[PDB]
Scaffold this active site. Structure first.
Site, mmCIF file in Angstrom:
data_model
loop_
_atom_site.group_PDB
_atom_site.id
_atom_site.type_symbol
_atom_site.label_atom_id
_atom_site.label_comp_id
_atom_site.label_asym_id
_atom_site.label_seq_id
_atom_site.Cartn_x
_atom_site.Cartn_y
_atom_site.Cartn_z
ATOM 1 N N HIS A 12 -2.054 -1.524 -11.569
ATOM 2 C CA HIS A 12 -1.105 -0.717 -12.321
ATOM 3 C C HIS A 12 -1.386 -0.496 -13.794
ATOM 4 O O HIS A 12 -0.750 0.390 -14.374
ATOM 5 C CB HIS A 12 0.293 -1.317 -12.194
ATOM 6 C CG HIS A 12 0.772 -1.384 -10.794
ATOM 7 N ND1 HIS A 12 0.999 -0.247 -10.038
ATOM 8 C CD2 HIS A 12 1.024 -2.430 -9.977
ATOM 9 C CE1 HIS A 12 1.385 -0.595 -8.825
ATOM 10 N NE2 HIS A 12 1.435 -1.916 -8.769
ATOM 11 N N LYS A 41 -4.672 3.662 -0.169
ATOM 12 C CA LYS A 41 -3.320 3.236 -0.552
ATOM 13 C C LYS A 41 -2.481 4.497 -0.743
ATOM 14 O O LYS A 41 -2.898 5.403 -1.462
ATOM 15 C CB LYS A 41 -3.326 2.396 -1.821
ATOM 16 C CG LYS A 41 -2.018 1.646 -2.032
ATOM 17 C CD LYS A 41 -2.001 0.902 -3.357
ATOM 18 C CE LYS A 41 -0.718 0.090 -3.511
ATOM 19 N NZ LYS A 41 -0.245 -0.033 -4.912
ATOM 20 N N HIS A 119 5.129 -7.017 -9.351
ATOM 21 C CA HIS A 119 5.370 -5.928 -8.404
ATOM 22 C C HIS A 119 5.932 -4.756 -9.202
ATOM 23 O O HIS A 119 6.727 -4.959 -10.119
ATOM 24 C CB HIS A 119 6.323 -6.411 -7.295
ATOM 25 C CG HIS A 119 6.962 -5.320 -6.490
ATOM 26 N ND1 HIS A 119 6.293 -4.599 -5.527
ATOM 27 C CD2 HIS A 119 8.241 -4.875 -6.478
ATOM 28 C CE1 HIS A 119 7.127 -3.728 -4.980
ATOM 29 N NE2 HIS A 119 8.313 -3.880 -5.536
ATOM 30 N N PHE A 120 5.500 -3.546 -8.861
ATOM 31 C CA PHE A 120 6.026 -2.326 -9.475
ATOM 32 C C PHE A 120 7.069 -1.785 -8.514
ATOM 33 O O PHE A 120 6.733 -1.418 -7.385
ATOM 34 C CB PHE A 120 4.925 -1.296 -9.706
ATOM 35 C CG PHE A 120 5.346 -0.152 -10.598
ATOM 36 C CD1 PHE A 120 5.987 0.948 -10.073
ATOM 37 C CD2 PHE A 120 5.129 -0.207 -11.959
ATOM 38 C CE1 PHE A 120 6.383 1.979 -10.888
ATOM 39 C CE2 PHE A 120 5.529 0.828 -12.766
ATOM 40 C CZ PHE A 120 6.145 1.913 -12.231
ATOM 41 N N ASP A 121 8.334 -1.747 -8.932
ATOM 42 C CA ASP A 121 9.390 -1.375 -7.995
ATOM 43 C C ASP A 121 9.664 0.123 -8.008
ATOM 44 O O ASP A 121 9.762 0.745 -6.949
ATOM 45 C CB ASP A 121 10.664 -2.165 -8.308
ATOM 46 C CG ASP A 121 11.566 -2.316 -7.104
ATOM 47 O OD1 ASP A 121 11.079 -2.809 -6.061
ATOM 48 O OD2 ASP A 121 12.754 -1.957 -7.190
HETATM 49 CL CL LIG Z 1 3.365 1.789 -7.284
#
Ligand SMILES: [Cl-]
Ligand SMILES: [Cl-]
Ligand SMILES: [Cl-]
Ligand code: NA
Length: 124
Positions: A12, A41, A119-121
């Site tokens: 990210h 992905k 984590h990217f929410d």
């Molecule tokens: Cl993402």
């Protein structure tokens, strides 16, 4: 065997540019961060801020995550991000992505000591 914090950085973080300036940004970045090895992905967001500014979100607004957990944090300010999403014609190994640049709040889940993003929410 990647730590959760290191996986977040790899997937990210892109502090080297202020914004995606080309339609091909996602195609290049998804490959160079090894997110198209073995499968495409389908969705991934890159954040164009310093690592320190993103880590600092873990001390900002505490909100629920989409999954119901309560270790998510929303950035007080908007940040420069790029959304990468597979197109309908994409299929492994010729992964193809649409690049959408935006300025939005980010929501991350934080864990650990030090307490950092894992984590990217979402973005808002
Ligand atoms: Cl993402
Ligand atoms: Cl890697
Ligand atoms: Cl509050
Ligand atoms: Na970690």
């Amino acid at each position: 065997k990647e730590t959760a914090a290191a996986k977040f950085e790899r997937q990210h973080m892109d502090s080297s540019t202020s914004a995606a300036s080309s339609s091909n940004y996602c195609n290049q970045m998804m490959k160079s961060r090894n997110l198209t090895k073995d499968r495409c992905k389908p969705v991934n967001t890159f954040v164009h801020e310093s690592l320190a500014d993103v880590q600092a979100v873990c001390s900002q607004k505490n909100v629920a995550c989409k999954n119901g957990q309560t270790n998510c944090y929303q950035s007080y300010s908007t940040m420069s991000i790029t959304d990468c999403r597979e197109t309908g014609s994409s299929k492994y190994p010729n992964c193809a992505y649409k690049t959408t640049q935006a300025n939005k709040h980010i929501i991350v889940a934080c864990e650990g000591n030090p307490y950092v993003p894992v984590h990217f929410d979402a973005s808002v």
